[PDB]
């Protein structure tokens, strides 16, 4: 009962921006144009625009259902560039469980330059409307959140935010990818990604992506892409565009493997709790089906016992690799308390990042091998 | 009578950061590590925070600058934006009046929107600079020689004045000279910054910024902002820039020889109004250039005789110089700053700075000297038959 | 009723050769080592020269070997370079038996080049038991077969061929496995001595690497091939090795999609009133369909068919394709179409069945319904 | 008193093949086209047969060789193997007696298995070359200077002798000199061949071969074998090599200056038995070098005094020179050919050629001269303390 799959997604991922008539050679794959500058006697300077990045941006825009897309050197760089749309005296409302890097940037950096940052549980209408002031210019939401996967009603959020006037709604769509969730179709003003994760999907490109429909909002972002210069390499653009060509077949396998991993973990006697949007046990599972076409490979769970049991489990994994990041073809496992949020503690506790919290990025390996790896590692821990 | 060349520069450019013992394979050239993440269970954890190929580049650039530390960024502008994030609302920035257009545009139209106060002053003179310094001043941004009129600033004199007033950061954008010819950190600057897009990489195929620093606390704050703002370069671009660094010494020497020859030809040409080249005795700060530099680059600025259209006729008659923006590559480029690069500086400021309708900026490349002179010769005769 | 899918294929494609412990950084993705040379003889046996061996190529070769069910694999600069290197295993006076309808480049090399250096070349229809064994002489040292053939997709009983060849002693059987990929067919498990690929096609799968691959089990045969890899030097770039190894990580989900799209296209074409004949191994109408099911786990996206009418109708159809792109090569994510008479086999040849109405499709990963519509409207343009 | 430097070399290395008008974007640097195939209707059809980035490189190298055509290959050895496929069973190949070990091994152990007869001749005395030519001779393969003893061959004299015997191809492996210092095609050679892995790319990060030719029929035969045998380079490698070419002139001049200083330091060093450097007056063909070359490279060969023990102590004590094979990069390398790069040459031919236990080959890089001399000084003193 998910939202129907987006039409022409695979076709557009392979063809949009890739027109061979763009090149004198009529190459079916766009060349990698490294050149920093161009003869005048189109393009003038690589930072302002270059063929390989433009092809990628055009492709991503179609996959987001957007008119425009802007590529950046990283997801955080995309976040920083979006925030430069504002001015001193503006207010930002940010979700209380956003990605750690987003939280850190708003709290310790953006707040230094006349921007007021308010962290709100945007799952509650009373708290979001109470936080909106005439100074509110930006609402930053992520869904599902990293790493506890709280889910936000995007269209409900947009309705609340957009009756208050001149407010931009950003959805960090990193966990879902545009194959499973289209925030712009749901009322968001900006669909933002860490392409470092699923979009590229091959664990070899750091990149951010920002898709938009509004004309003035696009021009303001395009100005900051060139003027701040947090631009991606044309080679990274090529590699990310290459990764996009398999996004549909990758994400479907992430869905299949992720669901199987989540169901196996939830029935495992050494697992205390599982958080996976595809499971009926997820508190927002019905909302997930209303606003998504499927689910990703990110599976979050709590192991029974203590930190010692989480450590024994993690150290006995042989296929899941103990590492940060996510969204690649390879399965990863991570303990957020020691690996990402090691500096955070009191905010950990309200957000549930405990000693037994484990986040899995379920990859594309054979399902039976992933389940077996989890099975033997959990038996090694065998907590009470 | 230039400063003696920096000792061991070529040796360090080829070897620093490149130690084969870093790799299990003992590869003589560092591998390109694209991996975004690293197995744990010590060293690296996430590519944006640090990765082998970038760290090798940063170590090499730091040595070339005489620096303890270096940070690589996605572009020169990204390096500028990251440096400016060191400050806070209420701080003042002093910027050189003749600066790269993108630097001027960023400070004037973006940074000023976030509680930062911006003052543009001619930092070649002390009366105007000290009049601009306020208790809120936290950053002084200079370029020398400036882009594009190539005004030269006494770096050590500027640093001494800036460092009397307490906790103020002096950045020298050293893009035009490269660390082979000028070491701002040896002259008292706090930061030596580059658009590595130009000479550092030198091959017109990498957009990148570089920031070298000595102060420990300044490095820790910049390193925090490199990871937290995420304006990081591709590991492949890092490899390509580090590859370009291996020929920086022989490239810059050829830029110097070709640049000097072009400047002398232009200065004796009957169709050239004025030449601005730090290597010529006619440059107003030539003696200062010899005291703070070991040589000069291929950037040649001159004013053509006649009007705006004579400058255009000259530019469109070139057959070896290519009409394009950017600089510092192996290929010779020509450009009219008023309409092409510093078109983002307001017109009133460009007239005060001498960025007129006849000012032309050359990036003299590594081609045969005779071919470059002949291209300039025939193009100038076409503009004035 | 196909062969069961090869176990652990997806897991091995992602993990074999990719061990993070190989690198001091413990990178989860192998770095690209461009270095031509390596420091020797330091205190405390390693690589010495890139052509002889380098980390990125060695990682690729180990991955491909596992995917082929092989002990060893050697990578080359192209599929043809792999073919030429294999032929250098022989000496003047040896005989080569080659299939009468191999890939044109294979045919051209044997006929016009190899025959000039003391090698006797015999072209035999290896689909016939008595024709193959009658051609074998005491001088026969190499039997080269391709299945299915390019482009008419004739299918050869690999195990039957190997059994017949290996009764006669010291003869090498090579199977060019380009059309099927190791995901759908394992010639070494069926008795072949060498499984050879143009990785330019499915193996890389992203139309941006030219490469050959050679997998083998026999120890002496591997040492002889390894000597020729270094001594002839037709080696691939380490960057290309990285790109091909990257493409391997999605081979299973790509090939599964090629199978599903290819089956739908082939089935659609066979019921189309303007198609004379369809040749697709997955269809029951294929003359060796039961044999395909016995020696393969599935089928690829290569669909061969004959259009009704004349050469002009074939041209009108190809001209009207909007999604399929008119170009040579195959095995990429994008759909391609080709008329072998004008494009590849131009320099009768009806004896092999490449007529004016022969069209070869490489069905890509686009949305199935978009591909079927493209074929439908293009076929209606011909014969209106 | 060398030949005058070739006119427009630097200009052409930077501009030939790099015309921005080739690309719709007008990029000043040619894009890297990885695409294996091309949409059909007027140029490319399949990457192995030809692709934009490789074609740009080939045009650039051709101009630098003073040639009409150039063909790029996956390695220097692949270029050698492709050239040899021009022949047929029954043909004879004459090869210089001192060549790169891999060249020697390929002809001796592989090409000889396919009806080709291989003769190793000291072509430095072109009297022995004329005695070796038979009606079956179709290919004469020389290197000058040779790897690693750096014997020098009169290319023009060699070409005159080879070409009066009719239809014989003369190849000069120009790897050690690069086209900046030597143009074999201008001296009568039919083919100028390189391991671009060395000086041409110059950055120790590309394995590649290059083949430049003027003859029309010879080019068509080579172009056919480039496509039909498929030993082609990656378009990315082509881009990297073309990038390296843009500094070839300034690199080679520094190799010349550093190589001369290293060679002079070694020759006056009391612990060095003999130095072989084409730029030194002591080189037996030094005057011939000045008549067919515009300068000299960084390859310096010498014999250390003493025994194998001293050669090992010297090599293990170097701090800047890296003990490794290959050459022509920005970094200085040192190597013992008898055990490392010419261990594949039979021991008997090794002693006859002077590839002994005390023979050391240096690839002098672009580091600061005084640092290079210091490293050699202390390492030689480690083998022979004062
Ligand atoms: C390259 N010779 C190198 C290779 C080292 S192998 C132990 C050396 O150090 O001597 C070379 C070649 C071969 O070209 P490739 O690109 O295939 O390596 C050919 N000709 C000469 C003169 C060489 O030096
Ligand atoms: C530890 S810095 C990188 C964090 C990474 N994006 C993650 O959430 O796993």
Q: What is the DSSP letter of A37?
A: B
Nearest to C377, CA basis, from C319, C326, C308: C319
E-strand spans in A176-315?
A: 190-194, 208-212, 271-275, 298-303
Q: Where in chain C is the domain with CATH 3.90.1150.10?
A: 252-384
Residue of D197, D331, D336, D337 to test ligand 1 pocket, by largest number of atoms within 8 Å of CB: D197
Integer CA distances (angstroms), B128 to B96, B131, B202, C282, D327, in order: 11, 5, 35, 82, 56
Q: Is the minimum CB–CB distance between A31 and chain D shorter than 8 Å?
A: yes
Neighbouring-strand partners of residue A191: A171, A211
Strands A332-334 and B69-73, by their bridges, are unpaired
- Which residue of C lies nearest to B51 if distances are taken between CA atoms? C25
Name D175's Cβ contacts closer than 8 Å, sequence gap at least 6: D76, D100, D143, D147, D193, D194, D195, D198, D199, D328
What Å resolution does this PDB entry report? 2.2
Mutate to test the interface with A, among B37, B76, B83 (most CBs of A within 10 A): B37
* Residue A188 to residue A44: CA distance in whole angstroms: 33
Residue nearest to atom 1 of ligand 2 (CA): A340
User: DSSP 3-state assignment of D385?
Assistant: coil
Residue nearest to atom 8 of ligand 2 (CA): A325
Q: Is the minimum CB–CB distance between A364 and chain B shorter than 8 Å?
A: no
Q: Assess contact for D300 and D266: CB atoms under 8 A.
A: yes
- The answer to whether the peptide bond before residue B145 is cis (omega within 30 degrees of 0) is yes
Q: Assess contact for A91 and A97: CB atoms under 8 A.
A: no
CA D23, D25, D26, D32 dihedral sign is negative
- Which residue of D lies nearest to A35 if distances are taken between CA atoms? D29
Report CB contact under 8 Å: C24, B24: yes
User: DSSP 3-state assignment of A127?
Assistant: helix
* Residue A334 to residue A300: CA distance in whole angstroms: 10
Q: In chain B, which residues have their Cβ closer than 8 Å to the Cβ of D249?
A: 366
- The tokens for D119 are 């003769």
For ligand 1, the distance from its centroid to the CA atom of residue B53, given in whole angstroms, is 27
Instruction: Please give the radius of gyration of chain D, using alpha carbons only, rounded to the nearest integer.
Output: 21
CATH code for the part of the protein at D249-386: 3.90.1150.10
- The answer to whether the peptide bond before residue B148 is cis (omega within 30 degrees of 0) is yes
For ligand 2, the distance from its centroid to the CA atom of residue A195, given in whole angstroms, is 13
**Which CATH fold topology does A7-247 show?**
3.40.640
* Residue C291 to residue A229: CA distance in whole angstroms: 59
Q: How many helices (H) and strands (E) does chain A have?
A: 14, 12
**Which chains reach chain C with 3 or more Cβ–Cβ distances below 8 angstroms?**
A, B, D
* Residue A353 to residue C127: CA distance in whole angstroms: 64
For ligand 1, the distance from its centroid to the CA atom of residue D337, given in whole angstroms, is 12
Q: Is the minimum CB–CB distance between B9 and chain D shorter than 8 Å?
A: yes
Neighbouring-strand partners of residue D90: none
- The tokens for B157 are 């004199």
Q: Assess contact for B92 and B119: CB atoms under 8 A.
A: yes
Q: Is the minimum CB–CB distance between A23 and chain D shorter than 8 Å?
A: yes
User: Within 13 Å of residue A248, how many CA atoms lie on the same side as its CB?
Assistant: 22
Please indicate whether residue D346, judged by its CB atom, sits closer than 6 Å to ligand 1: no
Can B223 be counted among the known catalytic residues? no
* Residue D197 to residue A247: CA distance in whole angstroms: 37
For ligand 1, the distance from its centroid to the CA atom of residue B320, given in whole angstroms, is 36
Q: Is the minimum CB–CB distance between D322 and chain B shorter than 8 Å?
A: yes
Q: Where in chain D is the domain with CATH 3.40.640.10?
A: 7-248
Q: Where in chain A is the domain with CATH 3.90.1150.10?
A: 248-384
CATH class of residue range D7-248 = alpha beta
Please indicate whether residue D100, judged by its CB atom, sits closer than 6 Å to ligand 1: yes
Per-residue exposure over A326-343, b if at least 16 CB sit within 10 Å of its own CB, e if not = bbbbbbbbbbbbebbbee
CA D349, D350, D351, D355 dihedral sign is positive
- Domain C7-251 = CATH 3.40.640.10: yes
Name residues 75-134 of chain C within 8 A of D (Cβ). Answer: 77-81, 83-84, 88, 90-92, 105, 108-109, 112-113, 116-119
For ligand 2, the distance from its centroid to the CA atom of residue A326, given in whole angstroms, is 8
Longest Cα–Cα distance in chain B: 75
Mutate to test the interface with B, among D28, D197, D251, D329 (most CBs of B within 10 A): D28
CB atoms within 10 A of CB C122: 15
Report CB contact under 8 Å: D8, B254: no
Name D142's Cβ contacts closer than 8 Å, sequence gap at least 6: D95, D96, D123, D153, D155, D158, D170, D171, D172, D173
Q: Is the minimum CB–CB distance between D27 and chain A shorter than 8 Å?
A: yes
Report CB contact under 8 Å: B35, A80: no
Instruction: Please give the radius of gyration of chain B, using alpha carbons only, rounded to the nearest integer.
Output: 21
Q: Which of B54, B97, B98, B100 is labelled catalytic?
A: B100
CATH architecture, domain defined by C252-384: Alpha-Beta Complex (3.90)
Q: What is the DSSP letter of D25?
A: T
User: DSSP 3-state assignment of B4?
Assistant: coil
Q: Assess contact for C292 and C299: CB atoms under 8 A.
A: yes
Residue nearest to atom 5 of ligand 1 (CA): D326
* Residue A335 to residue A342: CA distance in whole angstroms: 10
Task: Report the catalytic residues of D.
Answer: 48, 100, 173, 198
- Which residue of A lies nearest to C260 if distances are taken between CA atoms? A249
Cα pseudo-dihedral C282, C285, C291, C296, rounded to 10: 0
Name B38's Cβ contacts closer than 8 Å, sequence gap at least 6: A323, B44, B45, B46, C20, C25, C26, C27, C28
Among the partner residues A23, A28, A35, nearest to D29 by beta-carbon distance: A35
Closest ligand (CA of D340):
1
Q: Assess contact for B253 and D250: CB atoms under 8 A.
A: yes
Burial of B232: CB neighbours in 10 Å, binned 0-12, 13-18, 19+ = buried
Geometric angle at alpha carbon D71, from D65 and D73, rounded to 5°: 120
CATH class of residue range B249-385 = alpha beta
* Residue B241 to residue B222: CA distance in whole angstroms: 21
CA B50 to chain A, closest CA, distance in angstroms equals 12
Q: Assess contact for B226 and B261: CB atoms under 8 A.
A: no
Can B277 be counted among the known catalytic residues? no
Can B198 be counted among the known catalytic residues? yes
CATH architecture, domain defined by A248-384: Alpha-Beta Complex (3.90)
* Residue B278 to residue C79: CA distance in whole angstroms: 56
For ligand 2, the distance from its centroid to the CA atom of residue A334, given in whole angstroms, is 9
For ligand 1, the distance from its centroid to the CA atom of residue D174, given in whole angstroms, is 11
CA B276, B278, B282, B283 dihedral sign is positive
* Residue C9 to residue C185: CA distance in whole angstroms: 12
Burial of B21: CB neighbours in 10 Å, binned 0-12, 13-18, 19+ = exposed
Nearest to D203, CA basis, from B207, B247, B180: B247
Name residues 262-281 of chain A within 8 A of D (Cβ). Answer: none
**Which chains reach chain A with 3 or more Cβ–Cβ distances below 8 angstroms?**
B, C, D
* Residue A271 to residue A303: CA distance in whole angstroms: 5
| Residue in the structure block whose two tokens are 């992520």 | A142
CB atoms within 10 A of CB B7: 11
Mutate to test the interface with A, among B92, B147, B234 (most CBs of A within 10 A): B234
Q: Is the minimum CB–CB distance between D43 and chain C shorter than 8 Å?
A: no
Q: What is the DSSP letter of B184?
A: G
* Residue A247 to residue D91: CA distance in whole angstroms: 55
Cα pseudo-dihedral D51, D55, D56, D61, rounded to 10: 150
| Residue in the structure block whose two tokens are 């959990």 | A378
CB atoms within 10 A of CB B134: 13
CB atoms within 10 A of CB D346: 12
Name C223's Cβ contacts closer than 8 Å, sequence gap at least 6: none
Nearest to A327, CA basis, from A257, A267, A275: A257
Q: Is the minimum CB–CB distance between B340 and chain A shorter than 8 Å?
A: yes
CA B266 to chain D, closest CA, distance in angstroms equals 20
Nearest to A230, CA basis, from A107, A105, A134, A367: A105
Q: Where are the alpha helices (DSSP H) in chain B?
A: 9-15, 52-64, 76-84, 101-105, 126-132, 155-162, 216-229, 235-245, 248-267, 286-292, 308-317, 347-352, 369-383
Burial of B89: CB neighbours in 10 Å, binned 0-12, 13-18, 19+ = middle
Name B329's Cβ contacts closer than 8 Å, sequence gap at least 6: A36, A37, B198, B202, B203, B204, B363, B365, D28
User: DSSP 3-state assignment of D348?
Assistant: helix
Please indicate whether residue D17, judged by its CB atom, sits closer than 6 Å to ligand 1: no
- The tokens for B333 are 């480029």
Residue of A99, A105, A340 to test ligand 2 pocket, by largest number of atoms within 8 Å of CB: A340
Closest ligand (CA of C231):
1
Q: Assess contact for B298 and B169: CB atoms under 8 A.
A: no
* Residue B140 to residue D82: CA distance in whole angstroms: 62
* Residue B339 to residue C2: CA distance in whole angstroms: 68
Instruction: Quickly list DSSP for C31-87.
Output: -B---SBB--S-------BTTT--HHHHHHHHHHHHHTT-SEEEEESSHHHHHHHHH
């Amino acid at each position: 009962g998910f939202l129907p799959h987006f039409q022409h997604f695979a076709t557009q991922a392979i063809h949009v921006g890739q027109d061979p008539e763009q090149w004198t050679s009529r190459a079916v794959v766009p060349p990698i144009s490294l050149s920093t500058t161009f003869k005048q006697g189109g393009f003038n300077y690589s930072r302002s625009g270059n063929p390989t990045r433009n092809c990628l941006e055009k492709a991503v825009a179609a996959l987001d259902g957007a008119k425009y897309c802007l590529a950046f050197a990283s997801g955080l760089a995309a976040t920083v560039t979006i925030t430069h749309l504002l001015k001193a005296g503006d207010q930002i409302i940010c979700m209380d469980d956003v990605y750690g890097g987003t939280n850190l940037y708003f709290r310790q950096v953006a707040s230094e330059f006349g921007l007021k940052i308010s962290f709100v549980d945007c799952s509650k209408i009373k708290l979001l409307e109470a936080a909106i002031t005439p100074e509110t210019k930006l609402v930053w939401i992520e869904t599902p959140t990293n790493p506890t996967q709280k889910v936000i009603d995007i269209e409900g959020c947009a309705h609340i935010v957009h009756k208050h006037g001149d407010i931009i709604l950003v959805v960090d769509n990193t966990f879902m990818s545009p194959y499973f969730q289209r925030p712009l179709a749901l009322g968001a003003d900006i669909s933002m990604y860490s392409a470092t994760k699923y979009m590229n999907g091959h664990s070899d490109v750091v990149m951010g992506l920002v898709s938009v429909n509004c004309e003035s909002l696009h021009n303001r972002l395009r100005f900051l892409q060139n003027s701040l210069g947090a631009v991606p390499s044309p080679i990274d653009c090529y590699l990310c565009n290459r990764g996009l060509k398999t996004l549909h077949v990758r994400m479907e396998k992430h869905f299949k493997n992720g669901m199987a991993v989540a169901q196996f973990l939830e029935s495992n006697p050494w697992v205390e709790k599982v958080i996976y949007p595809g499971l009926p046990s997820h508190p927002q599972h019905e909302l997930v089906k209303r606003q998504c076409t499927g689910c990703t490979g990110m599976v979050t769970f709590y192991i029974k016992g203590t930190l010692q049991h989480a450590e024994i489990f993690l150290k006995n994994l042989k296929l899941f690799t103990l590492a940060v990041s996510l969204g690649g073809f390879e399965s990863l496992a991570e303990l957020p308390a020691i690996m990402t949020h090691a500096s955070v503690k009191n905010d950990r506790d309200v957000l549930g990042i405990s000693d037994t919290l484990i986040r899995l990025s379920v990859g594309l390996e054979d399902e039976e091998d992933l389940l077996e790896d989890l099975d033997q590692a959990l038996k090694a821990a065998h907590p009470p």
